[PDB]
């Protein structure tokens, strides 16, 4: 009933703050990817939209 | 693993898809 709320505090204390060195790591890898996907989806969407509308 | 008795090749799937896109592209944007 409350033993749980306890074990939580335990792990809650084992929370190692992120090394700014690591943060930037994951930050640059993810952001970089979102751009990869994003750029691609843009290269397709924009021109197709341009068209669908110019013809319409 | 699976119980399916019918395995289809990846390229097949891609194909069908391409078919579907082309046919639909025509249907809708065929009007000139």
């Amino acid at each position: 009933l409350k033993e749980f709320i306890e074990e939580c505090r335990r792990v809650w204390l084992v929370l190692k703050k992120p090394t700014k060195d690591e943060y930037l790591a994951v930050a640059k890898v993810t952001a970089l990817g979102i751009s990869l996907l994003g750029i691609i989806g843009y290269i397709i969407h924009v021109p197709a939209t341009y068209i669908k509308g110019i013809l319409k | 693993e699976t119980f399916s008795k019918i395995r289809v090749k990846p390229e097949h799937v891609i194909g069908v898809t391409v078919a579907f896109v082309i046919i639909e592209a025509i249907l809708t944007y065929g009007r000139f």
Partner: protein, 410 residues
């Protein structure tokens, strides 16, 4: 097992004949990505060029783009997941799941339920009037198209899952969001461009840069959570100094609970809007937009630009539901996957370890879900170009993909 005849009936991409080089896994991934993108450019066939705005909610979770070939994106698949998880997960269905027989059925039964939901959600979608003119034929026609685009997505999913990097559900969600952020920022109607003009006319209409800000905020915030770890000590009480610490990712339960919930919620609004303008407004009452009453009301999410401070009551109740739900799905997930102590043991004498895990795994599970659930809601409160829950899922999806590039780098 009384479904086995059916399972055999369903087609299933061939596992690769032999191993595939990362180079290929990519090319494969690439193609499915591009196909996915092209599919979102084709509208469904409807002699009548028209659609009642859009349910500003179904898309983000679903990787969909309503009014097109992928109008139901991944909805079907996930929705299916929601079910299988509830049933099995809780206990309403017994399954060891460590034995093939079980998985085979489980996995395959989800694969079937998903193919079903394709039309189910397609019917539901058309019914809810995502289109309007219900001419029985054109209506049947659309359902058909709609449903089939999703069936494809189910299979493309499998291709990535066997010949590519990551999964389909993942790729699609990310891909959708990422594209959105980029087109809505640098597209021809790009907020970012709009804002600039205002920075040259001395009349900065914040409303053009605010969302891009949110995106940035939510981003950094979500990345952070993706960096949090738990350091398990290893002070082998042998000699003095023979100490160490094995840090493990904090979001043990992962982010899956966020999709599963956000999905369930979204489904609830679809089904509700459906039962509303059909007959019994059970789950709620909707109007010129969505539901402003009912459970459906209390499961909606206000955002897409900034932080709304009109009805904070909705927020507190919503956040409660989000958190609990996330935890629910969190638990089930950890159970059905293999993140439970019982199983973990085998991998890592038995009960020795097993019982010890049983000491800590459970609390990490609930703590994780709860955390992300919170993180989800706050992300939504802030609002952001992409979705917040979207940027949320995306950040993590992208990352986990990268990791798999490494373990596949070897």
């Amino acid at each position: 097992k009384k479904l086995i005849p059916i399972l055999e009936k369903i087609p299933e991409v061939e596992l690769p004949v032999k191993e595939i080089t990362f180079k290929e896994k990519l090319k494969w991934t690439g193609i499915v990505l591009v196909l996915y993108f092209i599919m979102g450019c084709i509208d469904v066939y409807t002699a009548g060029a028209q659609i009642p705005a859009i349910f500003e909610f179904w898309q983000t979770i679903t990787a969909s783009r309503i009014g097109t070939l992928i109008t139901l994106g991944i909805g079907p698949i996930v929705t299916a997941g929601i079910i299988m998880q509830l049933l099995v997960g809780s206990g309403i269905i017994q399954m060891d799941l460590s034995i093939p027989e079980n998985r085979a059925l489980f996995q395959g039964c989800q694969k079937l339920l998903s193919i079903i939901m394709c039309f189910v959600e397609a019917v539901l979608f058309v019914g809810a009037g995502a289109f309007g003119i219900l001419t029985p034929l054109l209506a049947f026609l659309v359902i058909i198209q709609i449903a089939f685009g999703s069936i494809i997505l189910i299979y493309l999913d499998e291709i990535v899952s066997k010949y590519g990097i990551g999964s389909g559900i993942g790729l699609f969600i990310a891909a959708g969001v990422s594209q959105t952020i980029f087109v809505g920022a640098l597209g021809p109607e790009g907020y970012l461009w709009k804002f600039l003009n205002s920075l040259i006319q001395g009349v900065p209409n914040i409303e053009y840069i605010a969302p891009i800000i949110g995106t940035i905020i939510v981003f950094l915030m979500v990345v952070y959570a993706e960096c949090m770890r738990v350091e398990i000590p290893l002070a082998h009480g042998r000699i003095k100094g023979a100490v160490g610490k094995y840090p493990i990712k904090f979001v043990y339960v992962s982010n899956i609970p966020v999709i599963l919930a956000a999905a369930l919620f979204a489904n609830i609004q679809l089904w509700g809007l459906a039962l509303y303008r059909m007959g019994i407004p059970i789950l709620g009452h909707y109007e010129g937009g969505r539901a402003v009453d009912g459970i459906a009301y209390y499961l909606s999410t206000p955002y897409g630009l900034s932080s709304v401070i009109s009805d904070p009551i909705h927020a507190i109740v919503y956040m409660i539901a989000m958190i609990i739900t996330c935890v629910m799905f969190g638990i089930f997930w950890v159970e059905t996957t293999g993140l439970d102590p019982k199983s973990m043991a085998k991998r890592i004498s038995e009960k020795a370890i097993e019982h010890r895990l049983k000491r800590y795994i459970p609390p990490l599970t609930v703590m994780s879900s709860a955390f992300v659930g919170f993180l989800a809601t706050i992300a939504n409160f802030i609002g952001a170009l992409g979705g917040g829950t979207g940027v949320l899922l995306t950040v993590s999806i992208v990352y986990r993909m990268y990791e798999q590039l490494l373990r596949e780098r070897t």
